[PDB]
Design a protein around this ligand. Structure first.
Ligand code: G3P
Ligand code: G3P
Lengths: 249, 249
């Protein structure tokens, strides 16, 4: 009775046209035989290449970030611009944007709200730091991040939201969360959604895990009842993303 | 004895594929009969479209921003990625990135240095605020911004630099700097470069003006001896950019 899983590739700031062409061919040649939404999020400048080359019908293309409106915002890409070029998925609130690039809960929440209004599917990232984990604040943090986002959404908007629980200490560090750690958080998130948003919304909501997912640990994560797939960084640059997808069977 | 002028279009966060196709056709059909480097800086996601459609031999394509290195920087585009896709011009330090997106003098200077090391032509933006202007700090500000950049450059690197003097109060406000205001600043910048970098470097350096340039005011700006062309925002989205280019004759 889980909702449809998602296997999402966050390529981050990586790729050449040669490397992308090779990896997209790998993705194309991998026949997927279960119901899963695959997502690839290239850098902005690589979106047209991926749109030209990616043909696997289980995939959609996502942006890694956006701003809400067009205008005098040198260097940024807006949601209307993405929609016009055919991109209607976006990752918002990823941790280094929160950490490095000043995206507060309020800024993330506003972005998510705008994206939903413009018809995007949104992968909204939440997660605690190592300091917060060791201070026994994990629940408080992820619920605060989630409630900030929720405050700007209507109930219907949640049909467009995907949460990605990504402990900051697991991102790129080779220190994956255990299945029990991840399940604990996904369960408490889903219960919050059930009680604060709706029981229907909670049952349908995809809550993905991210942070050092690889092809060897993914199936055991996916076996937990409240884990609906993955947001994958480093391993999504490699052919083993195929087995991460198949770990959602 | 001016160096080769530049007419640069900063499209900012604007465009659809239909609007871009139409404007690029206008640019293509405009025959330019003098020595000028034209530059168009689309949003990242529009770079491939512009590369596919733009054919006027006086043009090159620029990014509106970049980060120095590839890696775990969700949402950002790096200098190596741009180089690989054929983009070897970049605008750095534009005012709302300084104001809105936390680019300090140190961050701008580091970006400019990295870009030069990677073989980019760089349009490095400097300029004072209205508050700084009214406090009689214009010179101090633009020289501080310039010297910060200079501190991370070798002499040879300056062959890749273009300065864009853009008073913040003139950006998008319909309040262009007068020719005398702009010339005063360009003269003091060039003298600083001459004395601190080299007399040869100063003679060859393009110092562009930006901030509410349009087709009607451009020629009178260009007539000033230390103005080498323009960084154009709003008017570069319109067919009248053709006459801004021709104002550098
Ligand atoms: C969610 C994403 O940032 C995790 O990156 P990994 O390299 O998969 O840890
Ligand atoms: C340099 C650039 O920001 C100026 O924009 P305008 O719209 O031309 O004032």
């Amino acid at each position: 009775a889980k909702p449809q899983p998602i296997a999402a590739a966050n390529w981050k700031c990586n790729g050449t046209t040669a490397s992308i062409e090779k990896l997209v061919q790998v993705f194309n040649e991998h026949t997927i035989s279960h119901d899963v939404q695959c997502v690839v999020a290239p850098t902005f400048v690589h979106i047209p290449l991926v749109q030209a080359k990616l043909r696997n019908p289980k995939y959609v293309i996502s942006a890694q970030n956006a701003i809400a409106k067009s205008g005098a915002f040198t260097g940024e890409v807006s949601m209307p611009i993405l929609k016009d070029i055919g991109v209607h998925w976006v990752i918002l609130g990823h941790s280094e944007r929160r950490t490095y690039y000043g995206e507060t809960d309020e800024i993330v929440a506003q972005k998510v709200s705008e994206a939903c209004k413009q018809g995007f599917m949104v992968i909204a990232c939440i997660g605690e730091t190592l300091q917060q984990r060791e201070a026994n604040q994990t629940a408080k943090v992820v619920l605060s991040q989630t409630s900030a986002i929720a405050a700007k959404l209507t109930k219907d908007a949640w049909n467009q939201v995907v949460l990605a629980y990504e402990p900051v200490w697991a991102i790129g560090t080779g220190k994956v969360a255990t299945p029990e750690q991840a399940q604990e958080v996904h369960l408490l998130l889903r219960k919050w959604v059930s009680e604060n948003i709706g029981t229907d919304v909670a049952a349908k909501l995809r809550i993905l895990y991210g942070g050092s997912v690889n092809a060897a640990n993914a199936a055991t994560l996916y076996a937990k009842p409240d884990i609906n797939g993955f947001l994958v960084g480093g391993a999504s640059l490699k052919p083993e993303f195929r087995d991460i997808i198949d770990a959602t069977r």
